[PDB]
Every structure is written in structure tokens, then in C-alpha cells.
Amino acid sequence: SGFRKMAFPSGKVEGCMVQVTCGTTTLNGLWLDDVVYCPRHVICTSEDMLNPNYEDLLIRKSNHNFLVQAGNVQLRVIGHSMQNCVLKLKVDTANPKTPKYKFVRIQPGQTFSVLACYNGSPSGVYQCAMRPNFTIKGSFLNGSCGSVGFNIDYDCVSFCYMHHMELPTGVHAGTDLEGNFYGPFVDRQTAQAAGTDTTITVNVLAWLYAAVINGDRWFLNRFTTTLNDFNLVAMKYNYEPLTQDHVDILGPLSAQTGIAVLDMCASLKELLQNGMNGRTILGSALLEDEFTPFDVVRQCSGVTFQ
Amino acid sequence: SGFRKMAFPSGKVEGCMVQVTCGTTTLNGLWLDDVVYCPRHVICTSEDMLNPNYEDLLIRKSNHNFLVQAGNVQLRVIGHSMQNCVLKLKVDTANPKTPKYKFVRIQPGQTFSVLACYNGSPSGVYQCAMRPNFTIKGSFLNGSCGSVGFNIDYDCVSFCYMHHMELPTGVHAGTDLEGNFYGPFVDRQTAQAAGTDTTITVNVLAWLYAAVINGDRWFLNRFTTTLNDFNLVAMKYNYEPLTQDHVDILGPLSAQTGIAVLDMCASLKELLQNGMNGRTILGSALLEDEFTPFDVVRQCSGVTFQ
Ligand SMILES: *[C@@H](CC(=O)OC)C(=O)N(c1ccccc1)c1cncc(Cl)c1
Ligand SMILES: *[C@@H](CC(=O)OC)C(=O)N(c1ccccc1)c1cncc(Cl)c1
């Protein structure tokens, strides 16, 4: 038993992290087969990141302007190209540690692991959710650009995020691995800001089920509610709507605990209207929304990856 | 910016996890050079784990009773011995992925990463603290026995924990890698229970400094307090005493934020006596005590590992 914010083992991704240097700019790259992927703003200087023309900036570069370090070993760049907001540096060596991988774009509400990296060297690993407003509440310092987020399915790494920037509220914005930003952000220095967020309702319900699985039951009650009547309450507390597909996705957790989904909604309703009155749920005094139904089943049932 | 419960990259440890089978019992082992380390209760059956004589049980085994699987490759056991509560299985192959490592025993209050494992296959990674009562609040299911906890210092893995059992309150107990239990627990089925816990005061102060570094300042005040007067308050809320060495360890964080340690203690005092009155600190509605001063400096400053 127990319940923790648990990331995927990071080793398959550690073997892909490299350091990319263009001029005085150093950040992280992702080395898969003979390609290194990195934020295109590596080609920008201080005054460039103001209002840059990336096509103009890139035509002025040569392969030799890109130094790629795989540990203490230098990779010769033999081609370069721009794909949306990412650079693709073709190198002469395929990475012998390339795992089986995919590039997948995730949905707000889904979770992933982040291997935070500096100078191509992994620093730490932690679990993140894509917020409804397409930001992530990460932990990133200067030089973390190019760190990636991912999920693992058996032996296959699904890369979903590459870190680009921090927004003024301290939250983080980035792209998928095709270079397409999550949300309405750009790789220039503007006054861009996050924009309003909501709480991921289906995830809170999953975490309440995780709590019941782990023996926290004080918040349960005999009442039920309808989906419409619950969604009226969710609106008022800035929770996003619950759909029938959410109810269906919560089916297995419902059947394992014997608590109907709509009964759990009644419990959530009471918690929103009354607070928790000095008690905790799974060691939190807040309603936690960064565990998906899958995360709960994975952790409370025990699936590994190889 | 941002602040997350962040584990060490796990790859150096992933390469050491193996599966150990004795009879019908399967658990995880740690393969370093030509030795596999695992809980000695692998040699016990259902009726054995009641009141076992491990020396009697082990003399009845042969090398061939131990099947060790390193992935889809079987390791031939060529010797076995007991060291306290762990088994040492000598195998004919040294692990080519052996990192530079040490066996270190940690103190209550210190943190480490856990690579949760099942059938020798890593499942997830997360950060844990050693509680003052020598338990850990982990996330472990049946079959996680033998999963290890560790820290990484540059390129060196300091192994500090091997998981053995879950206690009746859902918390976890285990040994260091010499087989010596943390706390007053035994690898038999008794009515053993955790015993009373306290909050790690110096860690809460470190996390308050992390919050200030990250722009949460609402809990700051102009008052100060003395070390004696603070420790009177800590006693009353089940916090453990703060010492002058704790104050010294908090020195760098004090100087970076310009908030005297004893001023932060005044803030903590106010938070204990008043609660947080609907506000949060670093996304928590509770005072968080599982970040050390080192964890805060590492994350808010950016040290990597290679
Ligand atoms: C990367 C900055 C870079 O490539 O130069 C070393 C970086 O990590 N940045 C960043 C992005 C945009 C503009 C300046 C700096 C970053 C990312 N996350 C958080 C923070 Cl504080 C900075
Ligand atoms: C390991 C049990 C084992 O070796 O048999 C497969 C295990 O993970 N155990 C455990 C320990 C002691 C007695 C029974 C089972 C365990 C550890 N942590 C949590 C839980 Cl729920 C069980």
C-alpha cells in the first residue's frame, strides 16, 4: 500500500541526453538514432530572442556551428534542419542506446515523467501533469531547455514534451517532439502569460479512489448525486465538467472499491462545499488532481516496464 | 523556478535489478560485481515466516535452489551466505553495468530515491525520507521486497535501503545493504508496529526557505524568536528539537534569502499556532518535512550527476 507521485524509471531516457552548443548558448538535446533534437532557440543570442526570424537565423549557420557532446565524446554534426520550434541536428553516429520510442502528443489532464537535465547531464526525475491551460508546474532552472517529458509502455518510450521556457507565474511551457507548442505560447520574448486554469475533475476522483484503496474512507457518505447536479457544483469551484466517458474510465476503480462513480461525486461535492475540516487524504490537505485513473491503477496494482 | 519531490535518475540502479527465486518465493535482488543481495526471507515459505530460524533454514539450501534472472538471462549461483537480514548470492558473472557504489546507512530525517521493482523489473521511482521512527512512507505492493533506496553523488550510487515489509499502518520497514534493519523491526511475522513519529523540524525550515526562493512570502513576519523559545513550541506540536547544528546547516539558505534562521523559526511558530488560514505554500496546505537543506539547495541551484 501507500501512494506516491511516482515517475517512470528514467534510464532509457538518460542514455539519450546530450549537450548542444551554438555560439554561447548551451542547452540539452535528445539523441535518437542519428538525429539530435533540441529547441530551435539555441541558435539565438540575447538580442535575438527578442523578436527573431528563425529562418533568417538558421540559414546563417553551418553544421560546424553546432557542437554536440554525448558525455565526454563529441558528435560530428553533418546536417541540420528546422521542424516547427525544434532543431534536428543530423550526426554521423547513431545512438547505440536508442530505446524503442514514439513521438506522441498528450492531452491536458494526462501525466508524464520529466528528466530534468543541465549541460546534457540528468539531474532529477519527477511526475508532471499537462494543465488544462497547457502549462506544466515543473521544476526547471536556467539551462534546463531541451529536457524532455515521457511515458513508458512496457519497453517503449513515448516522448511527449520538450521544455522551452518559464512563464512569469513560474510555470513552464514547451512543445511536443515535433516542435509544436503546447498551448498559445511562442519561442520569443513577449508578455505571454498562462491564462486561467481549472482543476482536473476526473483525476481528483481517481485519487479519491486511490485513497479508498489505501484505507482513507472518512470522506465517504451514503448520498449520491446525478451527473448534471454534480457538474453544476464543479462549475462553481472551477472544476472542469465530468463526462460520461470519464464515468466509464472510472469504472474499474468503482468496481474494485464498490463505490459507484456518482457516489464518489457526491463525496467530492461535500468536500468542495465543506473543505476537509482539519483532516488529510493520502497525506494531502488539498484535493490532488495530477493522478490519472491509469496512474492509480498502475500504482495500486503493480505494472512494471522492461 | 518551481519545486517538486524529485528523485535521482534511476538508470544506474535499473541496471542492477535482478529477480531471485527460491522455491515458490520470488523477489528482487541487487546485482553488484559478482554478488546478488536480497532479503533473506526469500528462503522462507508461508509457515516459515511465522517464527523462523534462518540459520537452520539456510543450511538446508544449496546453490541450485536459487534461480537468479537478469532480464531474460539466468545467472548461475556459485555461493551463498547470510549477512544479518540479507542474503549474498555469489554468481559466476560480474554485472557489467555495476556503477561506482557505496553501502551507506542514513539518519532519520535524510531523504533518498526508491526504485520500486517487481520480478526484477523497475516499475517507478520516487523520493522518500527516513522518518524519525525509522519507517518510510513508501509505495510498495506484494513482490516489492528487495527494491532499494539510494542517493547519487556525481557518478557514485550510495545504496542506503533495501525494502523488506509493510507494517500495519501502511508504512514500510527495511534494512541497510549490510542487512541491519532500520528501527526496531524484525523479518518475522509479529505484531510489530511503527511507534510514535515526529515532524522533521529542520526540513520544514528548509522547505520554507525553498518557498521564499520561489516567491511565496506571505508567511514571513518581522518578529524573531530565540532558539529556546522556538523549541518550547516545537515540543508542543510534536516537532523535534532544532539544534545549533541545524541552524548552521540552514546558514547558506538564510544568507541567500536574507531571512535569519531564527526569523524563519518565528514564522514556523506562527504557522503552527494559526495554521495557514486557507493559503498554500509551494502548492501544499500542510507543512512539508521531507526535503533536507541539501535537497533544497540542489533543486533551487541545479547540481547534476554523471
Ligand atoms: C534555457 C535557456 C538557454 O537555452 O540558454 C542557456 C532555459 O532553460 N530557460 C530559458 C528559456 C527562455 C529564455 C531564457 C531562459 C529556462 C527554462 N526554464 C526555466 C528557466 Cl528559469 C529558464
Ligand atoms: C515481498 C514478499 C515476498 O518476498 O514474497 C513474494 C513483499 O513485497 N512484501 C511482503 C513482506 C513480508 C511478508 C509478506 C509480504 C510486501 C512488501 N511491501 C508491501 C507489501 Cl503490501 C508486501
UniProtKB/Swiss-Prot annotation, chains A, B:
The active site is at H41, C145. It is found in: Host cytoplasm; Host Golgi apparatus; Host nucleus. It catalyses: TSAVLQ-|-SGFRK-NH2 and SGVTFQ-|-GKFKK the two peptides corresponding to the two self-cleavage sites of the SARS 3C-like proteinase are the two most reactive peptide substrates. The enzyme exhibits a strong preference for substrates containing Gln at P1 position and Leu at P2 position. Changing C145A: Complete loss of 3C-like proteinase nsp5 cleavage. There is a cross-link at K5, K90 (Glycyl lysine isopeptide (Lys-Gly) (interchain with G-Cter in ubiquitin)). Residues 1-306 form the Peptidase C30 domain. Residues 1-306 are cytoplasmic. Inhibited by pyridone-containing alpha-ketoamides compounds 13a and 13b. In turn, alpha-ketoamide 13b (tert-butyl (1-((S)-1-(((S)-4-(benzylamino)-3,4-dioxo-1-((S)-2-oxopyrrolidin-3-yl)butan-2-yl)amino)-3-cyclopropyl-1-oxopropan-2-yl)-2-oxo-1,2-dihydropyridin-3-yl)carbamate) inhibits SARS-CoV-2 replication in human lung cells. Inhibited ex vivo by michael acceptor inhibitor N3. Inhibited ex vivo by compound 11a and 11b. 3CL-PRO exists as monomer and homodimer. Only the homodimer shows catalytic activity. Interacts with host FBXO22; this interaction promotes the proteasomal degradation of nsp5. Cleaves the C-terminus of replicase polyprotein at 11 sites. Recognizes substrates containing the core sequence [ILMVF]-Q-|-[SGACN]. Cleaves and inactivates human TRMT1, preventing tRNA guanine(26)-dimethylation of tRNAs. May cleave human NLRP1 in lung epithelial cells, thereby activating the NLRP1 inflammasome pathway. May cleave human GSDMD, triggering alternative GSDME-mediated epithelial cell death upon activation of the NLRP1 inflammasome, which may enhance the release interleukins 1B, 6, 16 and 18. Also able to bind an ADP-ribose-1''-phosphate (ADRP). This is 3C-like proteinase nsp5. It comes from Severe acute respiratory syndrome coronavirus 2. The chain holds residues 3264 to 3569 of 7096 of the full protein.
